[PDB]
Design a protein around this nucleic acid. Structure first.
Ligand SMILES: [K+]
Ligand SMILES: [K+]
Ligand SMILES: [K+]
Ligand SMILES: [K+]
Ligand SMILES: [K+]
Ligand SMILES: [K+]
Ligand SMILES: [K+]
Ligand SMILES: [K+]
Ligand SMILES: [Mg+2]
Ligand SMILES: [Mg+2]
Ligand SMILES: [Mg+2]
Ligand SMILES: [Mg+2]
Ligand SMILES: [Mg+2]
Ligand SMILES: [Mg+2]
Ligand SMILES: [Mg+2]
Ligand SMILES: [Mg+2]
Ligand SMILES: [Mg+2]
Ligand SMILES: [Mg+2]
Ligand SMILES: [Zn+2]
Lengths: 142, 74, 43, 194, 136, 102, 141, 61, 55
RNA sequence: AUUCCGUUAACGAACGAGACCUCAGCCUGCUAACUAGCUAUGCGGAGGUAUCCCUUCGCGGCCAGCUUCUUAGAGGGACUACGGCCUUUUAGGCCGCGGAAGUUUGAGGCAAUAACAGGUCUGUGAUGCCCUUAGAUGUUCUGGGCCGCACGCGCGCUACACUGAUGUAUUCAACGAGUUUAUAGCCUUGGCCGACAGGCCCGGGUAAUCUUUGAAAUUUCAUCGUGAUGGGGAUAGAUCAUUGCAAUUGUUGGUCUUCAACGAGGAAUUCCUAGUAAGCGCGAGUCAUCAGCUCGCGUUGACUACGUCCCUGCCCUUUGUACACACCG
């Protein structure tokens, strides 16, 4: 088993993201935006993938299983508190957004804040800190 | 500098090279195997475990942060 | 909405629910920087 | 010959270990007659008086000098473990007594001459001076541990392996050791500033 | 030969294996998703972490017979990193400890101490002693 | 008609407290009573560290103020009347005497 | 009449007391055999009083050691000091003075701390710095 | 490269007292005494390895 | 002022709810052991209170 | 050490220094401990040959004994006492056995004369004079600000990694602090609920009685493998709780997600000589809620030197001065 199989893949694609084949599956999946070590770990656990294998060792069907697990956390008993999009503003649904969907959600939040002239939105627009930090001495880049 | 392109899984040539020469090394450690066979530390540890299972090497002293192995026979 | 000096005028929109009235009446004037004065450098 | 039942780490014997340098013989404690110890951990008071630290075992001095840089300060159990593993690797690679290898490395690493700064008022003037045996031993230990530490940094090779390699390459003047090169550079500068 | 005469690590491994083989433990559904404490960054690496924790807790109760959930939270706590702020002690998960204590009680290994906490039963003493004896 | 009478003595002065304890012990002994103690509890050291300056100028220097409280425990096996009579002896200022049962 | 002694070793805030009495030669700390003492690296310090005097001289005394306070190294040092002192006292009181002197000389010739406590203690810190001697960083401009 | 043994210590030398001046007696020739400047702690009875014995030490100050 | 307005702001906590029992200042109050004295007043009255300087 | 020996137109004195006092280090010697423990015994559980014997745990004995361990009162103890050298037959110094201790044993508190236009009128119902004193510079209420961000500086925290990060297993402190009992206020054990954050219910402690059975670095075994990488955690999104009358300009604390500079730092520059530096955590002050700060505490525990006046300064003496606001003359 120590010898690489002929099917070993050095580079694989998932949601238009390059995934390193040499990295372990748990930490290889983290290259996708919106997926971290905790979420990747639980997704691998729920998909029955063996955590000791590399990203390139597995088969494509296992990547599809991982993606369905990620896209339907509720179906696999992943709790609501474990998701990065809880109680959505418009739909009010709980889901794990990833890749360009995460950027779309972030842009929607920022533009919604800016449209109503909310203070946080104005701070975002001006390029200043939004979480109350002092700005006299730190955060100097331009 | 140039990054080291260590392999996480053996190819047939490197695996045969391991099985041939590694049992003849005076000192065997994961770092030594990684530097010689040009393999990752994890693959070096797995190869050391495999060689120990085969009985071709012996354990001089085992520690979490340092494993020292040597050829079974002179 | 009083900001400490004046009552700022706004119209309530559906998107502003669950927010504080303070969030729409800025209490400070945004900073626009003039040239540094005497004693800014050589510290 | 003097026979001592005390064995370092219960694995190594101080018998047949002899210092072969009259200059630094009196400032190295690695013999069966000079209070051998089981471990290089002795929690003694060696800074009370001048020259007292010369009575500390050389292995203990190496262990102490292995605790350099803030992140490692006070972590003596780790240093003792590193020394133990380095000694095991040295015995494996060279088939000699590790204590003898350490003694030879210390002897060969210590500089004999140095250039001391002289004058004043922003003048760069140096004059060659001799090195006392105790300072020679201190410099040897410092150079050996510095070489091991610099080799281990940002490298998959463990600290124990680097220390063992440095000690082996210093026991013989291989010039591949960091300590040997540093000593040669120091002596070259001293000769230039004669 | 008793538990005090064997290495804690080896005894913990042996007793975790024995507990898993027993089949009386009822692991909660969240064992594979929760961390062992707020101070942790990742879930336990070992899939058998629940049985190991139960064995360690049983050994602790065997040595001392007045421990409660808070005591076990302290016992398995540790430093918590705070990014750019210094570290401070942090307690571990209390739900895991409560569930493990209840499961161990269900097996008659421990019971409620009259003074509070949990105490090792005679059956628990016998089981741990036999496991320690078989380690050799 | 025998009870374990508990006497607690607290004071800031060691000499006065010790003298009062010795007087109580000798009084109890003179009546052929059983005396256990005096037991010296760990000294309580109230500590306050305050800056010397009434302002913020100068080297920050601090005053370490300590108030030490010494406590003693004496147990007598006798009736309430005899212990009440014994404790009636003159007590110097700064020593607090409390008598209780068990 | 029971034949036993109780001697204590000290190192910083660590206090260990050894109960030595007639027996078959068992040495246990807090009910655990002395062979399992932690950390494993300090087992040599723990066993030094035994490795110098050999196991035979301990073959007629049962040693039970209780330790408290201090840390992992201080507790080990206190334990070894207590073992040495307890053996010396037991030999003095129930064995010929000649053998007691011999074992005391053997122990002292190796390390004097095996019977004499180290008096070093933590120095109180002074205001104006984080440590006893270390002062706050000074700036002039 | 000769060996000499320190017979007595004359005292500290240099602007900061960095070096100590000592009188050393050559081991090979017991009737030849030389002046040397030594860096680092040194006491009577010490032996130094002289890479060259031609020079005579002079006060650095 | 009007009863419902004059001094109507709650003062159940914070520096504004406490003052020095000696001078009435609200700053640098020592609340340890119930002294409730400002640091200056406490440093003035320490000897009378019974606090001694040993080191 | 203006500390002493001595020299001596000085002789006798008074302050500072020392002495002093606090803490720490030794006492198997004294007094005494059910608010501290040990020992043996009686009973009980477990293991081992299972009765008797051995090992390990739990519970009682105010008529089992005792004070080694803990506490704190009284005392003892070091005086360089002793030995060898140097020094004026001095004052003294170096080394050395013994000793817990031989730098004044270690660390502190206290601390002279004469001064500064040094700080404080924003600690004070300390205070002169000046200003104001009802449309108030008084007082109170609402709201905002003291935190505002092209930039420069000071004290710091976190790092740049494998002497490591993460996940298990493992187990060693000290200084301290804690309630109005109202259903209950402060420290909080135990049980239940919850992934966490938190919530509910029995209760203990005005305290060597309860929290307190009370840390981390570290030790141990695995994963990671030189990749800004599972280093680093800045910035930001969503969402959930607690404090508070009120949390927006995020009070703080959780969950998932995002994953910036930083690869060891130029000229310059700080602190430090032993249980010290450094690393590691803990308690208290501030505190309804907030510690990267300060004051203390302990744990692991070093390198180097034990010298000098080169730099920066200080003390004494001699000497020059056109200085005395005193060379920033
Ligand atoms: K800024
Ligand atoms: K390395
Ligand atoms: K005024
Ligand atoms: K004040
Ligand atoms: K100077
Ligand atoms: K002077
Ligand atoms: K002149
Ligand atoms: K003049
Ligand atoms: Mg990602
Ligand atoms: Mg006692
Ligand atoms: Mg002024
Ligand atoms: Mg401010
Ligand atoms: Mg400061
Ligand atoms: Mg503990
Ligand atoms: Mg990263
Ligand atoms: Mg990280
Ligand atoms: Mg605030
Ligand atoms: Mg502050
Ligand atoms: Zn006041």
């Amino acid at each position: 088993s120590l010898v690489a199989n002929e099917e070993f893949q050095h580079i694989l694609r998932v949601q238009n993201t390059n995934v390193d084949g040499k990295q372990k599956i748990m930490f290889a999946m983290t290259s996708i935006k919106g997926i971290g070590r905790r979420f990747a770990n639980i997704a691998c656990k729920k998909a029955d993938i063996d955590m000791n294998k590399r990203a390139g060792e597995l088969s494509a069907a296992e990547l599809d299983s991982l993606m369905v697990v990620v896209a339907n956390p509720r179906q696999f008993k992943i709790p609501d508190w474990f998701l990065n999009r809880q109680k959505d503003y418009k739909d009010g649904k709980f889901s794990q957004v990833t890749s360009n969907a995460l950027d779309m959600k972030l842009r929607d939040d920022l533009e919604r804040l800016k449209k109503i002239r909310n203070h946080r939105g104005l701070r975002h627009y001006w390029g200043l800190r939004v979480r109350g930090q002092h700005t006299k001495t730190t955060g100097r880049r331009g | 500098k140039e990054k080291v392109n260590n392999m996480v899984l053996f190819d047939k040539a490197t695996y045969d090279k391991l099985l041939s020469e590694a049992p003849k090394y005076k000192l065997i450690t994961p770092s030594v195997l990684s530097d010689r066979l040009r393999i990752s530390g994890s693959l070096a540890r797995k190869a050391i475990r495999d060689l120990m299972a085969r009985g071709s090497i012996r354990m001089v002293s085992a520690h979490a942060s340092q494993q020292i192995y040597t050829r079974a026979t002179n | 909405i009083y900001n400490g000096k004046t009552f700022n005028q706004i119209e309530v929109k559906p998107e502003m629910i669950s927010h504080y009235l303070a969030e729409f009446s800025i209490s400070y004037k945004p900073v626009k920087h003039g040239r540094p004065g005497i004693g800014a450098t050589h510290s | 010959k003097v026979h001592s039942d005390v064995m370092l780490f219960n694995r190594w014997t101080y018998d047949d270990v002899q210092i072969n340098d009259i200059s630094v013989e009196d400032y190295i404690t690695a013999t069966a007659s000079k209070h051998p110890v089981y471990m290089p951990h002795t929690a003694g008071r060696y800074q009370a008086k001048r020259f007292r630290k010369a009575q500390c075992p050389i292995v203990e001095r190496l262990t102490n000098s292995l605790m350099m840089h803030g992140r490692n300060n006070g972590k003596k159990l780790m240093a003792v473990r590193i020394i133990k593993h380095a000694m095991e690797i040295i015995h494996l690679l060279t088939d000699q007594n590790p204590i003898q290898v350490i003694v030879d490395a210390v002897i060969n690493s210590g500089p004999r001459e140095d250039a001391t700064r002289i004058g004043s008022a922003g003048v760069v003037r140096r004059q060659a001076v001799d090195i006392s045996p105790l300072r020679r031993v201190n410099q040897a230990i410092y150079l050996l541990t510095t070489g091991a530490r610099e080799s281990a940094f940002r490298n998959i090779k463990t600290i124990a392996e680097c220390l063992a390699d440095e000690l082996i390459n210093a026991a013989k003047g291989s010039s591949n050791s960091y300590a040997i090169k540093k000593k040669d550079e120091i002596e070259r500068v001293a000769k230039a500033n004669r | 030969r008793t538990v005090k005469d064997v290495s804690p690590h080896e005894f913990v491994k042996a007793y975790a294996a024995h507990l898993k083989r027993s089949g009386k433990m009822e692991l909660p559904e969240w064992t594979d998703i929760v961390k062992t404490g707020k101070l942790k960054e990742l879930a336990p690496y070992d899939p058998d972490w629940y049985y190991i924790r139960a064995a360690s807790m049983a050994r602790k109760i065997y040595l001392r017979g007045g421990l409660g959930v808070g005591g076990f939270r302290r016992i398995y706590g540790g430093n918590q990193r705070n990014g750019s702020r210094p570290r401070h002690f942090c307690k571990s998960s209390g739900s895991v400890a409560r569930n493990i204590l209840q499961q161990l009680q269900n097996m008659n290994i421990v019971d409620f101490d009259p003074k509070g906490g949990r105490r090792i039963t005679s059956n628990g003493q016998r089981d741990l002693d036999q496991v320690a004896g078989r380690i050799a | 008609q025998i009870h374990k009478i508990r006497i607690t003595l607290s004071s800031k002065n060691v000499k006065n407290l010790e003298k009062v304890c010795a007087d109580l012990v000798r009084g109890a002994k003179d009546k052929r009573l059983r005396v256990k103690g005096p037991v010296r509890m760990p000294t309580k050291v109230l500590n306050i560290t305050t800056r010397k300056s009434p302002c913020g100028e100068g080297t920050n220097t601090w005053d370490r103020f300590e108030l030490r409280v010494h406590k003693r425990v004496i147990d007598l096996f006798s009736s309430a009347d005899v212990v009440k009579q014994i404790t009636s002896i003159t007590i110097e200022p700064g020593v607090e005497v409390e008598v209780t049962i068990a | 009449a029971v034949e036993s002694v109780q001697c204590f070793g000290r190192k910083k805030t660590a206090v260990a007391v050894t109960h030595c009495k007639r027996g078959r030669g068992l040495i246990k700390i807090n009910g655990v055999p002395i062979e399992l003492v932690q950390p494993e690296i300090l087992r040599y310090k723990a066993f030094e009083p035994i490795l110098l005097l050999g196991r035979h001289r301990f073959a007629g005394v049962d040693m039970r050691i209780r330790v408290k306070g201090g840390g992992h190294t201080s507790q080990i040092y206190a334990i070894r000091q207590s073992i040495a002192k307890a053996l010396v006292a037991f030999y003095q009181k129930y064995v010929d003075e000649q053998q007691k002197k011999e074992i005391k000389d053997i122990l002292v010739r190796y390390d004097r701390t095996l019977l004499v406590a180290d008096p070093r203690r933590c120095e109180p810190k002074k205001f104006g710095g984080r440590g006893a001697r270390a002062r706050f960083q000074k700036s002039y401009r | 490269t000769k060996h000499a043994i320190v017979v007595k210590v004359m005292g500290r030398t240099g602007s900061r007292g960095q070096v100590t001046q000592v009188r050393v007696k050559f081991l090979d020739d017991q009737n030849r005494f030389i002046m040397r400047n030594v860096k680092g702690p040194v006491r009577e009875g010490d032996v130094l390895t002289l890479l060259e014995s031609e020079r005579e030490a002079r006060r650095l100050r | 002022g009007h009863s419902n307005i004059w001094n109507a702001h709650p003062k159940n906590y914070g520096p504004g709810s406490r003052t020095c029992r000696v001078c009435g200042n609200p700053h640098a109050i020592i609340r340890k052991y119930g002294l409730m004295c400002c640091r200056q007043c406490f440093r003035s009255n320490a000897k009378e209170i019974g606090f001694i300087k040993y080191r």
